[PDB]
Design a protein around this ligand. Structure first.
Ligand code: CUZ
Ligand code: CUZ
Ligand code: CUA
Ligand code: CUA
Ligand SMILES: [Ca+2]
Ligand SMILES: [Ca+2]
Ligand SMILES: [Cl-]
Ligand SMILES: [Cl-]
Ligand SMILES: [K+]
Ligand SMILES: [K+]
Ligand code: NA
Ligand code: NA
Lengths: 588, 586
């Protein structure tokens, strides 16, 4: 297996890395581990103007006021248990959002703030028959309503909820109230079941309280039952949200129709569906184990055919200190991070199942030292029934001495490991910023990108509609539209000239500049920066982009093209002339 | 005969040999890479807002940014490392912001931006380089765009006698302005000599035009040379004016009725020249011809004669003008007597011998071109290791190319830059690595591993958060021990220590509408155990690394229970490192 990608060679896989607390998504080539692109999502990107432009702020909605995000869990949409390459979805734990990235243009095209919850952490996708739902955990228990009268986590109206988003519309589909809380989540290969770990069955707020119980659980959702209750109208709504809310809590020991709680030790974390569809595998964290839930025993669990919820556990291998996450090679082996022992443990799922029945067998095949304190790990295609067992990335939280010193803040160490053979081979240490938690790989042929925008792309269709109200044809026009104290500049552009190279406004006018890159040559992107006004955006081939700012300073103000586009790039500039307020009518 | 055959693979457990400091381009940060692996080790926020560390949100960062904290963007090109006696001293890195007209300083011991200045009375700080000798007393910065003075909206004419741009000198150590020099034309790139007396800058808009054709009309623009000693003498004598409300001394470096300033000389150079690069032997300012397929070599040791009026023609300081290829943009040096120049149009790096170029200019038939290496594609800047110092070591070359085309997997309509690593240690340049990068770093700078010394943990007396220590002192707080909530009208100031896996203050209560400042001190001393602080659904996020104090201010505008949590995985019980803010309604 080739490890190094030389000049002129291409990588074999795309990697989509979470940006962690930095808030973006990063596209890597694998196995080179080089970063090919950054996709802004919850961060504000100076380069493309994401968070500044009108198109991006429209997608972000009211949450455009936040300049931060905290993303952990990138996942690719699937059809019949295989990636279909349409969308990447990712969480925001900081401001409680889910974002969608369109993989043909490699941009965030939709974003939603999940209502009546705090902190979207775990996130994964329905696999079968396709990604109808995005499943997202809200991690923190809060009051309902959260109006400041009640703060007690033990109140009967304090809880968190499991969240289903319609992947295509990016509107809420339903929410399920649960006991305890929600950490990570995964889905089966039938569409009936999803599952989530809980570490706060105690509903505590202090460290000791959250570790009190010997077992928490993974909660299992019967999605068929949830859908059935929604269609029957058997649900409530919270606050001003129209999202159907179903009650998945136990009441006086009787189970809900929507949920079953499988006791699992202890403050469990990772929740990973095996690629053969057989198991939800929960990482025991404070317990030195993983718990294997047999997915084919869940219908019987939901039909009272089992005496004890633990009867759906068919394995609980002891693996090492601090199990956090598990991935799969498609050959019947699982790979689990041990945070405390600082290792990846490779183990055979069917032998662990046999040892659980007493048959003394050594299911542990290898322990590889990683550097250091691994969190998530990811094997290529692990989330599909095409898991190919080639590459493994372990994403470790302390890099210590593995890279040159760069001051008190250290990079993370995402290590590429060869798993095509019986023996795990550490091949590359990849330093990364801001703590990617997880990542996802896709074959090169699973991703199909556009090299030039379509003119009807929904990403800027609202801007096209605005332009139409002014009588503008964006493909041809270079016009300055005036409307009271608003000025709307529309221009085409082609290297190395802006189609409108000067315009004049009054001091205090609100200026919108809309630019259409009317060339069709791949890689010839333009920028637009207004000096000393905090204005910057990208305009790639056939894109329309727009940005709005106040001309608060009299005098002449240069704008220029920021993206090197031509040998005359330094010369692709223009001038905004601002007439002073004392020369125009005076308002208070 | 010597071959180029350095190893490029840095395997697991091995370390890079050089630091690389990449400009973040239009994205606004500075990036620390390891060389030769070309892996990004760290990102240093400067003009961008960084969600992860809180740069742009925290009180410490917004203090450093001053009023320009209102801007969420920057546009970087030119990172440079401070020097002593013409060698990197590892103290500071400086970088420009073309978008909002700033210069930033990064402290290389903590890898943070610690000072920032908006250059007064100019637009668009682009070219930037450092004094070399006797040390980096000044940062030299080019303002690219001609503007009216004053720029009050009465006059828009760039041909008006009070429309001009200025060369800028910033005191490297205080990060206050030292002086400005009005010039004719405009300013593109700049460099300094190896004595401290001279600096030079290319100009492309000697025409003072605003249109593309008008800017290319002159067969020759110039490199303007500055007699910094003469500027300093005039400032010491009080012979200067000031502009607007800035106290910065302003000297007039324009020609008047054909008579030279004592501060400047204008050396005619073809054509819209771009790069302006000092050879590592101190002999030449080398201007890259761009629209002219040449570079022009100015003999620095002729400049004293030029300013003393001993030369008949400013062209007499030109001692070479080699023809190299189409679209020369930038030049760097191996320390062995070769220069390496990017050809943007031909898409090559050309290696050429400077002394042979000089003899060729005298009419001697000698081939000074040694090799042309195809690069991929359209190179802008290039940088050989230690090239800006008299220790230029001729080992590594990076060419930063603007069109990557098919060199990487497709990723949509926007493509990465291609920063290509080239082995120059031997007689033949060898291309060894294609490094994709985001948002167009324009230029980069390398330093030996042993030239950079970083802190493993913060100093409690660090200036970076000294204003916060002072706030704490006014409240009677000992940041190393205290976990206290100070109430001051509708202001609430929470102070806490933190140790893994627990915030020192795990709950506090405020009134809806209160303005909340949370100050956190990471009181452990284990390297690499950083904490975060995020307030859910309030847009609040920041880093607190070991022994650091960080603070952030936000208004509690939502009644109810609002969780906060530690964003930096710091401990097996990281998920449980949380707290509650309780907000009472009216
Ligand atoms: Cu958010 S948790 Cu193991 Cu995923 Cu990192
Ligand atoms: Cu700013 S320009 Cu050739 Cu330096 Cu990139
Ligand atoms: Cu348009 Cu550079
Ligand atoms: Cu403190 Cu994670
Ligand atoms: Ca628990
Ligand atoms: Ca010119
Ligand atoms: Cl997981
Ligand atoms: Cl230069
Ligand atoms: K870390
Ligand atoms: K580019
Ligand atoms: Na939305
Ligand atoms: Na300052």
């Amino acid at each position: 297996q080739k490890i190094h990608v030389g000049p002129g060679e291409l990588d074999d896989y795309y990697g989509f890395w979470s940006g962690g607390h930095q808030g973006e998504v990063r596209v890597l080539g694998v196995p080179s581990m080089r970063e090919l692109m950054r996709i802004p999502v919850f961060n504000v990107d100076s380069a493309t103007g994401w968070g500044l432009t009108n198109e991006s702020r429209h997608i972000m909605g009211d949450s455009a006021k936040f300049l931060n995000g905290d993303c952990h869990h990138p996942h690719i949409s699937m059809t019949d248990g295989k990636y279909d390459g349409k969308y990447l979805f990712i969480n925001d734990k900081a401001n409680s959002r889910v974002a969608r990235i369109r993989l043909d243009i490699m941009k965030c095209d939709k974003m939603i703030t999940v209502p009546n919850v705090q902190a979207i952490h775990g996130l994964r996708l329905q696999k079968v028959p396709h990604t109808k739902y995005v499943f997202a955990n809200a991690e923190f228990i809060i009051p309902h309503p959260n109006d400041g009268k009640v703060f007690d986590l033990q109140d009967e109206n304090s809880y968190t909820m499991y969240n289903a988003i319609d992947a295509e519309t990016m509107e809420m589909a339903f929410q399920v109230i649960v006991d305890g809380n929600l950490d990570n989540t995964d889905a089966d290969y039938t569409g009936r079941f999803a599952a989530a770990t809980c570490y706060n069955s105690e509903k505590a707020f202090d460290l000791g309280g959250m570790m009190r119980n010997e077992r928490d659980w993974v909660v299992v959702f019967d999605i068929h039952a949830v859908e059935a209750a929604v269609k029957a109208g058997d649900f409530i709504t919270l606050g001003d949200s129209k999202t159907p809310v179903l009650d998945g809590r136990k009441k006086d020991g009787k189970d809900s129709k929507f949920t079953r709680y499988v006791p699992v030790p202890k403050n469990p974390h990772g929740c990973n569906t095996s690629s053969d569809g057989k198991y939800f595998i929960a990482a025991g964290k404070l317990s030195p184990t993983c718990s294997m839930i047999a997915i084919d025993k869940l219908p019987d669990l939901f039909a009272g055919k089992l005496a004890d919820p633990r009867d759906v556990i068919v394995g609980e291998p002891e693996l090492g200190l601090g199990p956090l996450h598990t991935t799969f090679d498609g050959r019947g082996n699982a790979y689990t991070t041990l945070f405390i022992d600082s290792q990846v443990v490779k183990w055979n799922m069917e032998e662990a199942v046999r040892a659980y029945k007493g048959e003394k067998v050594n299911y542990i095949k290898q322990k590889l030292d990683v550097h250091y304190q691994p969190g998530h790990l990811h094997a290529s295609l692990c989330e599909t029934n095409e898991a190919d067992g080639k590459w493994l990335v372990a994403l470790s939280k302390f890099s210590k001495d593995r890279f040159l010193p760069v001051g008190p803040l250290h990079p993370e160490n995402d290590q590429l490991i060869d798993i095509s053979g019986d023996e795990m081979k550490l091949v590359h240490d990849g330093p990364t910023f801001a703590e990617p938690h997880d990542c996802i790989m896709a074959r090169r042929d699973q991703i199909k990108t556009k090299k030039i925008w379509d003119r009807n792309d929904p990403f800027f269709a609202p801007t096209v509609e605005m332009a139409k109200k002014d009588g503008i044809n964006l493909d041809t026009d270079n016009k300055v539209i005036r409307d009271g104290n608003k000025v709307r500049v529309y221009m085409t552009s082609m290297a190395p000239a802006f189609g409108v190279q000067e315009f004049t406004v009054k001091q205090g006018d609100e200026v919108t500049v809309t630019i259409t890159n009317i060339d069709q040559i791949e890689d010839v992107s333009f920028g637009f920066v207004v000096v000393n006004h905090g204005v910057s955006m990208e305009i790639s081939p056939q894109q329309t982009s727009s940005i709005t700012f106040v001309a608060d300073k009299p005098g002449l103000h240069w704008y220029y093209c920021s993206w090197f586009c031509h040998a005359l790039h330094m010369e692709m500039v223009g001038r905004m002339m601002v007439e002073p307020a004392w020369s125009h009518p005076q308002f208070e």
